[PDB]
Design an enzyme around this catalytic site. Structure first.
Site, short mmCIF file in Angstrom:
data_model
loop_
_atom_site.label_atom_id
_atom_site.label_comp_id
_atom_site.label_asym_id
_atom_site.label_seq_id
_atom_site.Cartn_x
_atom_site.Cartn_y
_atom_site.Cartn_z
N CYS A 153 69.55 39.37 18.15
CA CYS A 153 69.49 37.94 18.49
C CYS A 153 68.74 37.09 17.46
O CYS A 153 67.53 37.21 17.33
CB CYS A 153 68.90 37.71 19.89
N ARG A 161 65.71 34.02 18.81
CA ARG A 161 64.51 34.44 19.56
C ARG A 161 63.25 33.59 19.39
O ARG A 161 62.27 33.83 20.08
CB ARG A 161 64.18 35.90 19.27
N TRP A 212 72.60 28.53 23.88
CA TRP A 212 73.54 27.63 23.25
C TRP A 212 74.10 28.38 22.05
O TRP A 212 73.60 29.45 21.68
CB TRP A 212 72.90 26.26 22.90
N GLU A 226 79.49 31.18 15.32
CA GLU A 226 80.11 32.01 16.36
C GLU A 226 81.49 31.44 16.70
O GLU A 226 82.46 32.20 16.82
CB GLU A 226 79.24 32.05 17.63
C1 HEM Z 1 68.60 29.70 22.70
C2 HEM Z 1 69.76 29.79 22.02
C3 HEM Z 1 70.26 31.09 21.46
C4 HEM Z 1 70.95 31.27 20.29
C5 HEM Z 1 71.32 30.19 19.29
C6 HEM Z 1 71.23 32.67 20.17
C7 HEM Z 1 71.92 33.23 19.08
C8 HEM Z 1 72.47 34.52 19.12
C9 HEM Z 1 73.55 34.97 18.32
C10 HEM Z 1 74.31 34.12 17.30
C11 HEM Z 1 73.79 36.26 18.63
C12 HEM Z 1 74.87 37.17 18.05
C13 HEM Z 1 76.05 37.05 19.03
C14 HEM Z 1 77.36 37.60 18.52
O1 HEM Z 1 77.64 37.51 17.30
O2 HEM Z 1 78.17 38.14 19.34
C15 HEM Z 1 72.85 36.60 19.65
C16 HEM Z 1 72.75 37.87 20.17
C17 HEM Z 1 72.01 38.08 21.33
N1 HEM Z 1 71.17 37.21 21.95
FE1 HEM Z 1 70.88 35.36 21.56
N2 HEM Z 1 70.64 33.34 21.18
C18 HEM Z 1 70.12 32.45 22.06
C19 HEM Z 1 69.49 32.70 23.31
C20 HEM Z 1 69.50 33.95 23.95
C21 HEM Z 1 69.14 34.20 25.30
C22 HEM Z 1 68.71 33.15 26.30
C23 HEM Z 1 69.26 35.56 25.51
C24 HEM Z 1 68.99 36.32 26.76
C25 HEM Z 1 67.96 35.97 27.53
C26 HEM Z 1 69.71 36.12 24.27
C27 HEM Z 1 69.94 37.45 24.09
C28 HEM Z 1 70.78 37.88 23.06
C29 HEM Z 1 71.24 39.27 23.06
C30 HEM Z 1 70.94 40.35 24.09
C31 HEM Z 1 72.02 39.40 21.98
C32 HEM Z 1 72.74 40.67 21.52
C33 HEM Z 1 74.12 40.93 22.12
C34 HEM Z 1 74.69 42.25 21.59
O3 HEM Z 1 73.93 43.17 21.17
O4 HEM Z 1 75.93 42.43 21.62
N3 HEM Z 1 69.80 35.14 23.34
N4 HEM Z 1 71.99 35.54 19.89
N1 5H3 Z 2 74.85 32.02 21.43
C1 5H3 Z 2 75.13 33.10 22.14
N2 5H3 Z 2 75.95 34.05 21.68
C2 5H3 Z 2 76.01 35.35 22.11
C3 5H3 Z 2 74.86 36.07 22.48
C4 5H3 Z 2 74.96 37.41 22.89
C5 5H3 Z 2 76.20 38.04 22.94
C6 5H3 Z 2 77.34 37.31 22.58
C7 5H3 Z 2 78.70 37.95 22.63
N3 5H3 Z 2 78.67 39.13 21.80
C8 5H3 Z 2 79.71 40.14 22.01
C9 5H3 Z 2 79.81 41.05 20.78
C10 5H3 Z 2 80.96 42.02 20.98
C11 5H3 Z 2 82.29 41.57 20.87
C12 5H3 Z 2 83.37 42.45 21.06
C13 5H3 Z 2 83.09 43.80 21.36
C14 5H3 Z 2 81.76 44.23 21.46
F1 5H3 Z 2 81.50 45.52 21.74
C15 5H3 Z 2 80.69 43.35 21.28
C16 5H3 Z 2 77.26 35.98 22.18
C17 5H3 Z 2 74.52 33.29 23.48
C18 5H3 Z 2 75.01 33.86 24.67
C19 5H3 Z 2 74.01 33.83 25.63
C20 5H3 Z 2 72.77 33.27 25.26
S1 5H3 Z 2 72.88 32.73 23.61
#
Ligand code: HEM
Ligand code: 5H3
Ligand code: HEM
Ligand code: 5H3
Ligand code: H4B
Ligand code: H4B
Ligand code: ZN
EC number: 1.14.13.39
Lengths: 405, 403
Positions: free
Chosen positions: B107, B110, B279, B284
């Site tokens: 993420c 953070r 957001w 993305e």
């Molecule tokens: C506040 C605005 C936020 C932005 C701009 C942001 C941005 C991102 C981005 C760009 C990713 C990569 C997503 C992807 O390419 O699929 C990500 C991953 C992630 N973020 Fe955020 N984030 C935000 C808030 C949060 C919140 C609120 C949570 C949970 C409480 C969170 C938890 C995660 C997690 C768990 C991932 C990893 C997902 C994975 O491993 O597939 N983030 N974040």
């Molecule tokens: N900006 C955001 N983007 C985001 C954050 C966490 C996860 C994701 C979606 N990721 C999915 C990645 C993915 C796609 C296809 C297959 C797979 F195994 C894993 C998107 C947020 C989502 C929730 C809070 S911030």
């Protein structure tokens, strides 16, 4: 099912298993508790003989004489040689095979589709710094080939018991000087501040341009390095222009044609070639994105953005992205116009995907460092971004070595 | 040996000592690094994760060693020994949810980790109730475009029964309709969830941007279908600041990214349904969702409209079109007053976050391949920053698809 890393391509949905990683004899920097994949620098007797035997086994496999009488005789020859001298020597064809294999094995190289096409200059007879220079000049002439670039490596004598090393002190055969100014900034290439000052400490009369070609500092065993100026006619350069932005030529930017890396160690069968410079051709992002736009390099993004009349006061105008794209285009256009081989990052990554398929069939996998293979602009626009990769160390290898000073 | 971590742009060096607190193995070994892979390949153990978490919490409120602390450890211990499980207090859950976000190596957002609205939905007993909570979450988080990060936590997994699950991977997803001839209309990432919806009785549309219904599942029951009220789903039409034909493409994206298929693990307890939202970072949408070849794949359409030479890679037509697409997303979100962050601002704030975390905890788990944006990598400071990836708990994890 299979007890080997499962590797997925997310664009295509396709799956492979890397079985080659089992042949890795050397640890990388990662553990189950933490991944260190993103670090740039991850931190003999019977030992030689086992590396030797393994290399000789690889050689005899590649000529399909594995288990043969010629194979068993070579093994005996090597152990006999080590037994009496503490070292051994490679046959010419073993050197050629090992150099190509070391390139084939390099996880950070996106250019490996070309690995079978390498001109190996055997310079293992070299005995002075002056002769190193002649060999290097010949390498440059052959490799440059008036712009039609050709991959080559020149191999100087291996490290030897007690005796001092052959070393090229410069990190590349062509490097622009970087002169630290009164104000603390740098004119030229900040990457080369330390080599530049070494060149001056060793008697070079410094210039004061942005693109002054450095002399080579060449070190023959147990001697002080000696300074050699490359004849200017041997160093092909490309002035940079843009296909539609006519002012870009006025910036007076240029880059050299030949990327030739000179500070890496070539390890083959436990033998160590501390001077073994190698060259190919550039992928265009190396010049247009990293060398010209890194903040700690030429750092030209803002100057270009200003000339483009972009809004540099806010990140959300994407001024950096727009300027970088035009700089990359200028590199590609200028090299093309000048008839100097260059490959763009789309064409390079497509060919690397082909390389991965070839190697899956030939060896059951291909060691690859994802962070390095994915280009520094337009990452997910290239097929490699969507490809999982397994990074591991195989030998023969190109390795980092400490600076001679 | 603790890792030395270098920033190559600045020459500065830190040491990650936080990694020694990792109890969970990643996929790497000394023989080979698997860092680029997307997915992974008893009472004493629960009790020690629970204690570790209770310890983290009381330390967080400065109350380590106190009577409140030792009594909570006894409560947790008595509950596990008798029942094989235990329950969190609301304040512990709130702390745990923020910490799981803080600990998420992929993420980039953070810097915000302390600012998270936590909806406790553990008193939820039916798919119907899950829907009500989800609707309230969306309404709250959307806030007419002024997005606010939120999480809703549904009841934890329990040994004797099926999980509460949201089947959809996000609360807002566009349909993907597979054609007789293999190709896809809409979002190819959602073909499977789309077919599941139809099969559970949804009447499909036939557009490129049809918002899917939710499939919500209470324990050991078939999932139920719930259409989201259209007023709850804020969308942004995409136009470009200077290229007038761009609006003609008919492109849009939704405001609220709300991920709904990840498992939230706190103190050994597992929350199989805990959707969270923040957001978007503009790449993305602009780069991945719209330009991936296995997604909407619009690069060619845009390049043609821009009259670029698509016959050769070396015109950098792909790069030029992608930049304009990201610009359109930023412009359009700004015009609609919907929160979004570009990849420069986001990576700059992530660097500040790395520095805050170094001071606060002696490190920060980060997955370089996910933190560096998918365009303009080396133009952002995160490219030049070494990062150490490892798993801390509380954590967000992947879990199987429930079908
Ligand atoms: C506040 C605005 C936020 C932005 C701009 C942001 C941005 C991102 C981005 C760009 C990713 C990569 C997503 C992807 O390419 O699929 C990500 C991953 C992630 N973020 Fe955020 N984030 C935000 C808030 C949060 C919140 C609120 C949570 C949970 C409480 C969170 C938890 C995660 C997690 C768990 C991932 C990893 C997902 C994975 O491993 O597939 N983030 N974040
Ligand atoms: N900006 C955001 N983007 C985001 C954050 C966490 C996860 C994701 C979606 N990721 C999915 C990645 C993915 C796609 C296809 C297959 C797979 F195994 C894993 C998107 C947020 C989502 C929730 C809070 S911030
Ligand atoms: C044929 C044209 C070639 C192209 C386009 C090419 C491309 C590249 C690029 C772009 C890099 C990354 C460099 C960086 O970012 O600093 C690289 C790394 C490398 N390539 Fe090549 N390559 C080519 C030929 C060669 C040859 C001929 C050799 C040696 C025989 C070689 C061995 C290497 C090695 C060892 C590295 C890794 C350097 C390191 O770890 O720091 N490649 N290649
Ligand atoms: N196109 C090329 N690029 C290239 C290939 C290998 C190495 C390099 C230079 N890499 C330097 C990376 C670097 C810089 C500073 C510090 C550091 F640790 C590592 C460049 C070729 C050079 C030789 C044959 S192909
Ligand atoms: C910290 C990070 O590993 C470092 O900036 C790397 C990332 N990827 C790279 N990739 C290539 N090809 N060349 C590089 O110098 C780097 N630098
Ligand atoms: C194979 C590779 O790991 C995969 O494509 C990753 C790379 N980096 C990513 N980074 C982000 N933020 N999101 C992603 O989906 C991915 N995909
Ligand atoms: Zn790793």
């Amino acid at each position: 099912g299979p007890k080997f890393p499962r590797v997925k391509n997310w664009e295509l949905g396709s799956i492979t298993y890397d079985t080659l990683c089992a042949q890795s004899q050397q640890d990388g920097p990662c553990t189950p508790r933490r991944c260190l994949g993103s670090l740039v620098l991850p931190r003999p007797a019977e030992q030689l003989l086992s590396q030797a035997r393994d290399f000789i086994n690889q050689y005899y496999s590649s000529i399909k004489r594995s288990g043969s009488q010629a194979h068993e005789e070579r093994l005996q020859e090597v152990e006999a040689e080590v037994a009496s001298t503490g070292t051994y020597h490679l046959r010419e064809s073993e050197l050629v095979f090992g150099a190509k294999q070391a390139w084939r094995n390099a996880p950070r190289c996106v250019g490996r589709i070309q690995w079978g096409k390498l001109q190996v200059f055997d310079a293992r007879d070299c005995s002075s710094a002056q002769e190193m220079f002649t060999y290097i000049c010949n390498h440059i002439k052959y490799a440059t080939n008036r712009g039609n670039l050709r991959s080559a490596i020149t191999v100087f004598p291996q490290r030897a018991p007690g005796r001092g090393d052959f070393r090229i002190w410069n990190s590349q055969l062509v490097r622009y000087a970087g002169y630290r100014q009164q104000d603390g900034s740098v004119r030229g290439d900040p990457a080369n501040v330390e080599i530049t000052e070494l060149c001056i400490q060793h008697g070079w009369t410094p210039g004061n341009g942005r693109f002054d070609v450095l002399p080579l500092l060449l070190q023959a065993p147990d001697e002080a390095p000696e300074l050699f100026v490359l004849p200017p006619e041997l160093v092909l350069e490309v002035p940079l222009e843009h296909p539609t932005l006519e002012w870009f030529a006025a910036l007076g930017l240029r880059w050299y044609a030949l990327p030739a890396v000179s500070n890496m160690l070539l390890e083959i069968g436990g033998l160590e070639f501390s001077a073994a410079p190698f060259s190919g051709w550039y992928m265009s992002t190396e010049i247009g994105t990293r060398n010209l736009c890194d903040p700690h390099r030429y750092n030209i993004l803002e100057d270009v953005a200003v000339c483009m009349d972009l809004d540099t006061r806010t990140t959300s105008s994407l001024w950096k992205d727009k300027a970088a794209v035009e700089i990359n285009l200028a590199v590609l256009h200028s090299f093309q116009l000048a008839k100097v081989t260059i490959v763009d990052h789309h064409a390079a990554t497509v060919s690397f995907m082909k390389h991965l398929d070839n190697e899956q069939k030939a060896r059951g996998g291909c060691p690859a460092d994802w962070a390095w293979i994915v280009p520094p602009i337009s990452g997910s626009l290239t097929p490699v971004f969507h490809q999982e990769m397994v990074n591991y160390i195989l030998s023969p290898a190109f390795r980092y070595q400490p600076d001679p000073w």
